[PDB]
Amino acid sequence: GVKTEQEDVLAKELEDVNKWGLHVFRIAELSGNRPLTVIMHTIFQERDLLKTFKIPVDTLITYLMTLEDHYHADVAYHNNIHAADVVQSTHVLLSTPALEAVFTDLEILAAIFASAIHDVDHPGVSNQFLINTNSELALMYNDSSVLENHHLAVGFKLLQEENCDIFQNLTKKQRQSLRKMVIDIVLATDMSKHMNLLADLKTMVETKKVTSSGVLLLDNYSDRIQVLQNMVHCADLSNPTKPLQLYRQWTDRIMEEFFRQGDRERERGMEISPMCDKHNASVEKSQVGFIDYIVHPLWETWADLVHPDAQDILDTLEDNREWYQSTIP
Numbered sequence: 001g002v003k004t005e006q007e008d009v010l011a012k013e014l015e016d017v018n019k020w021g022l023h024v025f026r027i028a029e030l031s032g033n034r035p036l037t038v039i040m041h042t043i044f045q046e047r048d049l050l051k052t053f054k055i056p057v058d059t060l061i062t063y064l065m066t067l068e069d070h071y072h073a074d075v076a077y078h079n080n081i082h083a084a085d086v087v088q089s090t091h092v093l094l095s096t097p098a099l100e101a102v103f104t105d106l107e108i109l110a111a112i113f114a115s116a117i118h119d120v121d122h123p124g125v126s127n128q129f130l131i132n133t134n135s136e137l138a139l140m141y142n143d144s145s146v147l148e149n150h151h152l153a154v155g156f157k158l159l160q161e162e163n164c165d166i167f168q169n170l171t172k173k174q175r176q177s178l179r180k181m182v183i184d185i186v187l188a189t190d191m192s193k194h195m196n197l198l199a200d201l202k203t204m205v206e207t208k209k210v211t212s213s214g215v216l217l218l219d220n221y222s223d224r225i226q227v228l229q230n231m232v233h234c235a236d237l238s239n240p241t242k243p244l245q246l247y248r249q250w251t252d253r254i255m256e257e258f259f260r261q262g263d264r265e266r267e268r269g270m271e272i273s274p275m276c277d278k279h280n281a282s283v284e285k286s287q288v289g290f291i292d293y294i295v296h297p298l299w300e301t302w303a304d305l306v307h308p309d310a311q312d313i314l315d316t317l318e319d320n321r322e323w324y325q326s327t328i329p
């Protein structure tokens with residue numbers, strides 16, 4: 001009933017689970033490529049979600065290992081380590097002081113579970129690639145948020161495997177509420193939704209109320225779900241806000257993925273996608289573009305919403321932006 005030495009070293013790294021910049025890759029190595037399972041289990045125990053939702057612990061572990069196993073290890077970016085990172089980053093964003101006591105335990109469970117499933121069974125190519133290749137997935141989802149619809153369907157279907165139904169003790173009301181929130185959240189991770197989500201988040205910041213404290217008032221579903229959607233979307237787009245050692249690893253992985261899709265697009269005479277030609281795409285300029293056009297406008301607006309809680313994050317992002325800029329020859 002005492003840990004192995006490797007389990008102990010893992011446990012000590014997981015003491016950082018409430019911090020931005022957790023050594024997620026080290027967790028992946030130390031857990032035997034189970035970062036998603038160990039991070040999720042840590043979070044669920046820390047937030048007391050097993051007791052609140054009467055989730056049997058063997059069921060939770062069984063589902064999480066099954067979920068993690070449906071992430072592709074042969075995909076460089078959209079794998080279980082990315083899922084783990086998004087979960088952990090959501091977990092940190094949920095604890096921001098501006099949001100203290102705002103969300104219910106079911107909303108928290110929704111954001112975390114959504115984060116965990118949000119890229120499951122990702123094949124490592126884009127929606128447009130799937131549509132253009134006449135792929136089964138694209139056909140199934142009548143070309144609309146093909147990947148995101150699939151991540152949802154798989155995340156939910158896996159609950160039906162042996163001893164996997166982590167929601168077995170929720171009421172039907174709880175489950176229907178949870179399910180809707182999870183679907184709303186995952187579907188908002190499709191980048192085709194980014195401009196409208198951001199536009200809505202800016203509107204909310206313009207007309208923002210607070211309960212004196214400095215804490216946000218969110219008194220209808222539209223607003224509550226929009227904040228959760230944008231929060232998970234920020235987590236999904238959090239790579240350039242992390243310390244540079246982490247960010248570069250993410251960049252390597254996204255470029256490997258993109259370059260592999262670019263290889264398959266070139267071979268079939270297809271129009272090669274943005275940043276996916278390994279001959280004609282500069283990594284550093286791509287990252288500066290990503291930050292300027294997508295990541296900084298989102299995070300700046302998030303930092304407004306939760307001011308001043310996200311200042312250090314936004315600083316890191318701006319530092320990384322300058323680092324990448326300064327390395328352009």
Ligand SMILES: COc1ccc(C2=NN(C3CCN(C(=O)CN4C(=O)CCC4=O)CC3)C(=O)[C@@H]3CC=CC[C@H]23)cc1OC
Pocket residue numbers: 189191236237239240250251254274275286287289290291293294
């Ligand atoms: C760490 O590094 C990255 C991590 C994730 C992504 C994602 N990117 N994307 C879209 C691809 C096409 N996009 C663009 O090229 C947009 N854009 C401009 O218009 C100017 C320059 C620029 O970047 C939008 C984002 C994804 O869809 C991935 C899946 C989900 C979330 C983000 C991921 C990109 C990264 O490095 C560029």
Ligand SMILES: [Mg+2]
Pocket residue numbers: 118119147189190
């Ligand atoms: Mg995705």
Ligand SMILES: [Zn+2]
Pocket residue numbers: 082086118119236
């Ligand atoms: Zn993702």
